[PDB]
């Protein structure tokens, strides 16, 4: 599964499912897994982190 930047999305955050939002996509040279710069949509900016897609779910 991918995810594209925009998309609504729920994100672990400290091992709990938050609804959030894809801020940016970025290829990981080294390995070239995509890894993804959420924001959590009832958290402030500073709790934005890049997470792989392992930690992701769709959201609809």
Known sequence: ???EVRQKVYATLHETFHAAIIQEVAHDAHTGQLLY???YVEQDSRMDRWLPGSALRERR
């Open 1 to 3: 599964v991918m995810f």
């Open 37 to 39: 710069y959420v924001h």
